[PDB]
């Protein structure tokens, strides 16, 4: 059929300057992350440092759902470059230098341990036994 | 014989029994994923050290100008008869000093001991 | 007498032995972690 | 001594000392040898040994998954994961970054007054003095995991006997310092 | 609606991307073009059994780029987007990832030797003076 | 005296006395490579099919070959025996490398 | 056509005796101070932060290429002449060369009056010269 032997031609530009930046961000493979129930997302700068040149927050779903921390890839772009090809009814690819490069990491919310009774914890070095009555306490 | 990992926060996984319907499940340090049966087998460990040793031959070791080549031994996968033979030598002692040979034909990694 | 074994005849190849665990202390230190520690 | 492995990475760029190693069987039964053989690090500036799942938790990883990705390439093989997770049992007080730096700011010789001295103190050293050949800029951090990770999974393939012990006089491992690099270092 | 909120209607339409490695010499002319409209042609050939996919770069813009493909189930791969107007979006998913290479065997090097004289331009070395200071 | 000062360091020359083998000199031909930026090296290999290590997926360096440049990771590489004669043919011809 | 074994104790010979008329015996010492002059000081003293004041005014100083001269010698009467080895070694002195130094210094009076001064060759110190290197008067 026409599948077998393909032949199409699709024509490439690239815009000089544009209003909207574009970066790039990436999931681990095994992370399993779904956008169909990203009905609500915020990302927005961090405070933990109190804007640039600092990580990101994601969240998604308010409180209740994930939430991820995004830092810059170390990579700097002077001898590299990244476009992305976007389809349009018009066809011709859009050739979209890249900005920056993001990575997010899973954070999972619960009740987490606190350094100061950690400090306390740390007389049970190896002397711990019942690993997971620990929690039970917190 | 192995451990995973739980697809909540990606973390260990150690075996338990509840104290409601007796059976082996897994469970993470923080997550209510508990894991079931088909890896009921927690700590084997070969004391005698009687592993394969034709598992971590690379088969790359045919492209190495030090190793030396025979002719007397033909390849039984893909019937070269050139070959590359050497000996284990890890960080192991007592070892038997047996020659692993690797066929030195391209795209066949074939090794085998005698 | 806390860890009975059943012994094997010696015409298998295996000639395993199956010690556990009973009531005399079962009736802090966890299972699995008791009996991993009397392994080593 | 008490120390069966070590992984000696002395570092420099165009020097800090790192002493990633590994605690022997010295100890018997559930006080010590409950678990197995413990990895741990040491570092430059701090003056204690840290464990490197703590350190690896400060780098900014979270999820153990990517940790014993680090550690470990291929998952077919158990050796190494039977043989790396007693530092995962000595690893469940720290779970988040900021704690790992609050611990490891602590261990050091001068810690700070509070969070805001002790986690900026463990981020320095952590920053430019952790391998400074792989990264010294700010955003230089999973070449450091990646590294640290290449350094662990030595340790434990001379560990379980596949890498063969270095030797220092080999000359293989040796750099001579000529009028060159000295009267630079002076100069 | 809010202004942390990322649009997720490029990945509710499940638009598969492309994600392609270039050398420098490529980037620079496309630079250079400034968006004239066209820097080149895409070609692809698929066999009874095999693909071929290559790039030819165009005559007005020179005065063949063979492309290799790899694997990419190794990781997840998507794009987003920011705005001046602070209106997050998301454009789609990578599905394919490419490397762009030059047809040239032998004569590339050549090239390769005047960049590496455009970039020891700028690094600077010490000099003899015949004449001690005034 | 090692297996390995072969060329390296005369084998007969040595002091006498409390300095014996912590002393010696060099043999007729031994020149001691005295320094060179990697940025070169990199950016070539970055020309060629060299994956980043920031880059790369997590699962996809265990079958590859790991690349050192000045004892600093760089990355990975698949195909490693062509990258050994591309390497060693450039450094016979001394012009990038 | 190829080297037989006859002519063979002869053209390895021819071969390294062009070595050792194009290096040298003492040629690491050589190349080594080689590479030290021409790079890594200026290097060095690139690399070192250009240094800051404050008091309001702003002074900062930066440093840029590093010029040696020959081996100087500086007499009662305050003469430079270059200076013999023979020179050197007879009079007890020290063979050196003089090291120079531009530096700009840039000025900033909080009223965008930033008119540098290129401040010219100085004299900061002489490095000991390493005989018959290319940096030497032999
Ligand atoms: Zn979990
Ligand atoms: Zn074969």
Request: overall charge negative; charged content about 25%; hydrophobic content about 35%.
């Amino acid at each position: 059929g026409p599948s077998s032997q393909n032949v199409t031609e699709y024509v490439v530009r690239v815009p000089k300057n544009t209003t909207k930046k574009y970066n790039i961000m990436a999931f681990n493979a095994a992370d399993k992350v779904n956008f169909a129930t990203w009905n609500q997302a915020r990302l927005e700068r961090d405070l933990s440092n109190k804007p640039e040149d600092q990580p990101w927050l994601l969240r998604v779903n308010g409180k209740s759902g994930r939430k991820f921390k995004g830092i810059k890839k170390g990579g700097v772009t002077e001898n590299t470059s990244y476009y992305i090809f976007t389809q349009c009814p018009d066809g011709a690819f859009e050739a979209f230098p890249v900005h920056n490069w993001y990575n997010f990491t899973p954070l999972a919310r619960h009740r987490t341990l606190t350094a100061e009774e950690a400090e306390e914890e740390w007389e049970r070095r190896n002397k711990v036994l019942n690993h997971f009555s620990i929690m039970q306490q917190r | 014989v192995g451990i995973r990992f739980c697809q909540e926060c990606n973390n260990m996984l150690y075996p338990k029994e509840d104290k409601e319907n007796r059976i082996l499940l897994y469970a993470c340090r923080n997550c209510d994923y508990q894991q079931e049966a088909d890896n009921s087998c927690i700590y084997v460990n070969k004391i005698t050290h009687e592993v394969d040793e034709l598992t971590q031959i690379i088969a790359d070791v045919s492209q190495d100008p030090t190793l030396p080549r025979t002719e007397d031994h033909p390849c039984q996968k893909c019937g070269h008869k050139e070959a590359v033979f050497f000996q284990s030598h890890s960080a192991r002692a007592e070892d038997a000093m047996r020659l692993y040979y690797v066929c030195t034909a391209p795209h066949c990694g074939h090794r085998w001991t005698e | 007498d806390d860890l009975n074994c059943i012994f094997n005849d010696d015409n298998a190849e295996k000639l395993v032995l199956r010690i556990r665990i009973m009531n005399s202390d079962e009736n802090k230190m966890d299972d699995d972690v008791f009996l991993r520690c009397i392994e080593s | 001594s008490k120390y069966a492995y070590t992984g000696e990475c002395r570092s420099c760029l165009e020097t800090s000392t790192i002493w990633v190693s590994m605690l022997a069987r010295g100890g018997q039964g559930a006080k010590k040898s409950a678990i197995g053989q413990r990895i741990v690090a040491t570092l430059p500036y701090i003056k204690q040994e840290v464990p490197i799942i703590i350190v690896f938790r400060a780098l900014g990883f979270v999820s153990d998954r990517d940790i014993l990705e680090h550690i470990i390439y291929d998952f077919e093989d158990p050796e190494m994961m039977e043989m790396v997770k007693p530092s995962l049992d000595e690893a469940f007080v720290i779970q988040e970054q900021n704690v790992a730096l609050n611990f490891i700011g602590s261990r050091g010789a001068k810690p700070g007054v509070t969070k805001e001295k002790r986690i900026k103190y463990a981020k320095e050293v952590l920053q430019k003095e952790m391998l400074p050949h792989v990264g010294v800029s700010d955003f230089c951090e999973t070449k450091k995991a990646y590294f640290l990770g290449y350094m662990v999974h030595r340790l434990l393939l001379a560990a379980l006997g596949r890498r063969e012990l270095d030797d220092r006089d080999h000359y293989g491992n040796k750099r001579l310092d000529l009028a060159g690099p000295l009267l630079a270092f002076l100069f | 609606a809010e202004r942390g909120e990322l649009d997720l209607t490029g990945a509710k339409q499940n638009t598969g991307v492309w994600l392609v490695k270039v050398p420098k010499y490529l980037s620079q002319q496309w630079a250079k073009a400034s968006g004239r409209g066209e820097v080149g042609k895409l070609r692809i050939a698929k066999t009874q059994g095999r693909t071929e996919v290559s790039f030819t770069l165009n005559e007005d813009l020179a005065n063949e780029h063979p492309f290799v493909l790899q694997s990419v189930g190794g990781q997840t791969l998507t794009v987003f987007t920011e705005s001046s107007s602070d209106k997050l979006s998301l454009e789609g998913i990578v599905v394919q990832r490419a490397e762009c290479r030059p047809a040239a065997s032998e004569n590339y090097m050549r090239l390769k030797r005047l960049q590496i004289e455009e970039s020891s331009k700028p690094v600077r070395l010490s000099q003899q003076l015949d004449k001690v200071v005034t | 005296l090692h297996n390995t000062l072969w060329g390296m360091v005369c084998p007969a020359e040595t002091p006498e006395g409390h300095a014996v083998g912590l002393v010696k000199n060099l043999a007729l031909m031994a020149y001691i490579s005295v320094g060179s930026q990697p940025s070169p090296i990199l950016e070539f290999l970055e020309e060629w099919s060299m994956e980043n290590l920031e880059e790369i997926s997590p699962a996809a360096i265990a079958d590859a070959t790991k690349i050192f440049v000045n004892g600093c990771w760089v990355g990975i590489h698949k195909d490693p025996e062509q990258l050994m004669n591309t390497l060693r043919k450039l450094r016979r011809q001394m012009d990038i490398i | 056509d190829e080297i037989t074994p006859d002519l063979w104790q002869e053209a390895c010979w021819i071969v390294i005796s062009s070595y050792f008329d194009e290096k040298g015996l003492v040629r690491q010492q050589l190349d080594s101070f080689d590479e030290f002059i021409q790079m890594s000081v200026q290097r060095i003293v690139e690399d070192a932060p250009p240094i800051d004041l404050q008091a309001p005014p702003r002074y900062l100083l930066k440093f840029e290429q590093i010029y040696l001269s020959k081996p100087t010698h500086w007499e009662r009467d305050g003469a430079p002449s270059p200076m013999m080895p023979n020179e050197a070694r007879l009079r007890n002195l020290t063979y050196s060369a003089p090291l120079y130094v531009d530096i700009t210094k840039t000025v900033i009076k909080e009223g965008e009056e930033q008119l540098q001064t290129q401040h010219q060759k100085t004299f900061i110190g002489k490095i000991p010269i390493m005989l018959r290197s290319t940096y030497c008067l032999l």
